[PDB]
From a paper:
We therefore set out to characterize two previously unstudied proteins from the shipworm symbiont Teredinibacter turnerae that were initially identified by the presence of carbohydrate binding domains appended to uncharacterized domains with probable redox functions. One of these was TERTU_3803, which contained both a CBM10 and a CBM2 domain attached to a range of distinct modules (via flexible linkers) that did not bare any sequence similarity with catalytic domains typically found within carbohydrate-active enzymes. Taken together, these sequence analyses suggested that TERTU_3803 and TERTU_2913 could have a role to play in cellulose metabolism, and furthermore that role is likely to be a redox one given the presence of cytochrome domains within their linear amino acid sequences.
In addition to our work on Ttpf08450-X173, we produced TtX122A and TtX122B, representing the X122 domains from TERTU_3803 and TERTU_2913, respectively. With the structure of TtX122A in hand, the structure of TtX122B could be solved to 2.2 Å via molecular replacement using a single protomer of TtX122A as an initial search model. Three molecules of TtX122B were present in the asymmetric unit, with chain B’s electron density most readily traced allowing modelling of residues 2 to 235 without breaks in the chain. To check the oligomeric state of our TtX122 structures, PISA analysis was performed, which revealed that there were no significant molecular interfaces between protomers in the crystal for either structure, suggesting that the molecules would be expected to be monomeric in solution. Our subsequent structural analysis therefore focused on single protomers from each structure. 4(a) and 4(b)]. Very similar results were observed for both TtX122A and TtX122B, in which there were only very small changes in antibody binding following X122 treatment in the case of some alginates (predominantly PAA and PAU) and wheat arabinoxylan, where twofold or threefold changes in antibody binding could be observed. We were unable to detect any fluorescence in the tissue from the X122A:GFP or X122B:GFP fusion protein alone and only a weak signal was observed for the CBM10-X122A:GFP protein.
Numbering used by the authors:
A (entry chain C): 3 to 162, 165 to 235
B (entry chain A), C (entry chain B): 2 to 235
Write the structure that this text describes.
């Protein structure tokens, strides 16, 4: 059923992209989301993958994200974006966690969500409110890199099944998967095998760091769907 | 049940209609003039192949070029599989009407009662006649994944009737699910006129080749064609 | 008094045959040439795992890639368990002859005296050799449940001999019973040439890996393998 795409060609430069809500500076639908602020998510022609327009996120400790509501009753979600980042993800000393993409239950907070990006310097996933992280600690501060300053196609597949799954592809290669309790470091989201329940109300993209890293991220050619996407 | 048939085209004599198949060529069932001296045709070729030295080559367009085989009676499902090499892409194409490489029909005599898999409106997808419904819906037209031109692709179409409340179609290309039907709202124009059991009566013939309703001429080669009432995979 | 062994493959060196296992690779018992440079092999791998960092990877096909462990003498019953990740499915598939992931054999030297669990004629099931009986019966071929490809599945096979009038096999995947033998008529040809005690002599070795008699090459990973004369858990 469900499909949405956005190449950002329809939006006006310097504005919040048409059709999207925001999570900017810790506020849902921050009235003050513009490029004159220090944190923002706006259409740019500064750079793009398709056409002349992409979205530009400037954020850090404070999140800069666009948000879209998802229809009720989804059994799976695929999120796909072309992504260009001022810093790399993965194989990174002294990272706590940082994320570019995810799904959340309630628009008003960042406290109940699945966050895809890196955890402990490996590509991976943080679930809140449990604050579990995957993969487990044997793998931290290593593994594959999403390089800075090049366009990457990122696909996250989330399937909700006896154990809910997540798979994250970059440039076609599978860099991260969750398929059992033991893929979480701290036991598996406090014992919940159906850990994506309640999570599929919103999809979000942009940048949020809990490692105090300020970043510019551009994204383009976003898709979400309840059927497989690929690059 | 247990139905399975395979053809690698290795046994057939070059430049002839593959042995064992009927045709639908130039709008005629078992056209008697199916060779390379016509404008549309379906013949064994040794110039390109996936398996061995031989494939079937289809040249057609607005006029269909197709090989056809009857099915057993009483099938609850059909799987069709082919290695496919196309002179033009399917999918993500401006201003397409619809074009198909593969499908099933009720009556060999015409092309007016069938399920056609290929693209509709420039998205990989499915056309049912005579309702003329198409899927997916308009919000996805002229976009989505491609079956690229000028490369070998494994194509699998799965059509499930049986005891399903809603009949299903799934099309895999090179392992990846590119197109699915599982509810009335997968159709653009309602839902094959309200028929949840939309594959009923359709499983009499299976056909392969090329037929465009966008007036696009094409060369398709196919090889390692398979048909079955149990799953096929690449 | 009982018997329990498990292997999570965490102790073993990557690219080596797992520590403490024998092999049956390329139709040779304890093939000295078992590494990732050969076309067929069974080795510890770190690119994929269920538990920890390590699992065992089999690459094989027509030629078997298996790890083998002796079982103690005197057993009345055997449970095998593996976490299994396959590059192709088992069950519900057109045109299969038979393929197996798991089993027990009477002697290490050969593949000719054994119980083979996997699929038979495209249903999940069991082949006994040398009788070549297969279960379930023909009624059920090319259908039924699947072990899907490209996911981790817990496979438990229970084989009960002992004082049963008719020896039994039960195969669970992810908790669901997918295959059962408890009478002569569960076999297509009436039960291993009239032998009600068809596991007799079979419990000398357990093996795990891949072997196809349908000419399908595959990559399998397995992990958390257990054997026991008592029930096993997922
Ligand atoms: Ca764009
Ligand atoms: Ca051929
Ligand atoms: Ca392990």
């Amino acid at each position: 059923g469900f499909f949405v795409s956005d190449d950002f060609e329809s939006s006006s430069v310097s504005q919040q992209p048409a059709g999207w809500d925001n999570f900017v500076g810790w506020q849902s639908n921050n009235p003050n989301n513009n490029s004159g602020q220090a944190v923002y998510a706006v259409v740019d022609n500064s750079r793009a993958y398709s056409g002349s327009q992409s979205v530009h996120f400037k954020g850090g400790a404070a999140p800069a994200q666009i948000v879209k509501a998802l229809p009720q009753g989804l059994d799976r979600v695929y999120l796909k974006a072309m992504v260009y980042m001022s810093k790399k993800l993965g194989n990174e000393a002294n990272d706590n966690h940082e994320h570019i993409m995810g799904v959340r239950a309630n628009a008003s907070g960042a406290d109940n969500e699945i966050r895809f990006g890196q955890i402990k310097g490996h590509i991976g996933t943080n679930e809140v409110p449990s604050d579990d992280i995957a993969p487990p600690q044997s793998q931290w501060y290593s593994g594959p890199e999403i390089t800075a300053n090049d366009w990457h196609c990122v696909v996250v597949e989330m399937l909700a099944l006896a154990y809910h799954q997540l798979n994250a592809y970059v440039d076609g290669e599978l860099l991260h998967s969750i398929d059992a309790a033991n893929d979480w470091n701290n036991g598996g989201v406090n014992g919940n095998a159906h850990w994506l329940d309640g999570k599929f109300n919103y999809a979000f993209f942009g940048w949020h760091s809990f490692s105090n890293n300020d970043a510019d991220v551009w994204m383009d050619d976003i898709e979400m769907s309840d059927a497989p996407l690929t690059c």
